[PDB]
């Protein structure tokens, strides 16, 4: 239904070990499709999804130039922020940026995004109006002044409402057999005694795509949010994801527990119980 495109940039300084490394990766929903690493033997934008391979040489050269140029700009930016915070030239720091567009279930731009962080803390972000900024502190205020003077917001709005959506729609069509295919989770419940009067019920969700999913345990129809151990959704390595939720229950009360699964690929929500 809904879709998004995001580029994630990571620029990391490393005093004494060369110039800052710049890495960029591009995603359509939960599928990465391109990468660029300034540390590669030969820095170039490279395909990471089959459907992007059909793009011509001009695409790959244009992208490589963009990322090569960003490599230099982000190095300047790291020097600038080091200064804004009166930091030593001896520490390592990181600037991260993520931007992209969200489309609704009809193909129209739902909203745009452009956020930056410094050493893992929000630094500056383009507001939802795509015309104003929110700076985290007086340092970010300096960056804001620069960007307004350079009309950066206008450049982002043009991109987000234009090129971003146009190319996302192109990718969705070229890779429709995968990007527009939701794979439902294969589910089951396992039972692991932990003592004579308690056992662990673990609800599994495997092989699903996209990553968005909801796993919950109910006791007599009541959600066990506080007593449920939910691991982070993890990649299987074949594009799909895995996840599980576990709850320790009193031996003999297993049937009072039900696992509920919600995922875009399921013809209908699932309700499972342990089956001895």
């Amino acid at each position: 239904g809904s879709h998004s495109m995001r580029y994630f940039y990571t620029a990391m300084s490393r005093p004494g070990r060369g110039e800052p490394r710049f890495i960029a990766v591009g995603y359509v929903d939960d599928t990465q499709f391109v990468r660029f690493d300034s540390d590669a033997a030969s820095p170039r934008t490279e395909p990471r999804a089959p459907w992007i391979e059909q793009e011509g040489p001009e695409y790959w050269d244009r992208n490589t130039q963009i990322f090569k140029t960003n490599t230099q700009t982000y190095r300047e930016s790291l020097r600038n922020l080091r200064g804004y915070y009166n930091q030593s030239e001896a520490g390592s720091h990181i600037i991260q940026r993520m931007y992209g567009c969200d489309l609704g279930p009809d193909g129209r731009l739902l909203r745009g995004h452009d956020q930056s962080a410094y050493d893992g803390k929000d630094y500056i972000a383009l507001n939802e109006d795509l015309s104003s900024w929110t700076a985290a502190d007086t340092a970010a205020q300096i960056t804001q002044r620069k960007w307004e003077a350079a009309r950066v917001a206008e450049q982002l709005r043009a991109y987000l409402e234009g090129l971003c959506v146009e190319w996302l729609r192109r990718y969705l069509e070229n890779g429709k057999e995968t990007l527009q295919r939701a794979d439902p989770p294969k589910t089951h419940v396992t039972h692991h005694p932990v003592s004579d009067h308690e056992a662990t019920l673990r609800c599994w969700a495997l092989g699903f795509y996209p990553a968005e999913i909801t796993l919950t345990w109910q006791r007599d129809g009541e959600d066990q949010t506080q007593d449920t151990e939910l691991v982070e959704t993890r990649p299987a390595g074949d594009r799909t994801f895995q996840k599980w939720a576990a709850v320790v229950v009193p031996s003999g009360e297993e049937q009072r527990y039900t696992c509920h699964v919600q995922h875009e690929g399921l013809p209908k929500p699932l309700t499972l119980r342990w089956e001895p």
Partner: peptide
């Protein structure tokens, strides 16, 4: 497709 270089404005 990524954000064009444009004016290459540093932070």
């Amino acid at each position: 497709e990524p954000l064009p270089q444009g004016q290459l404005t540093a932070y």
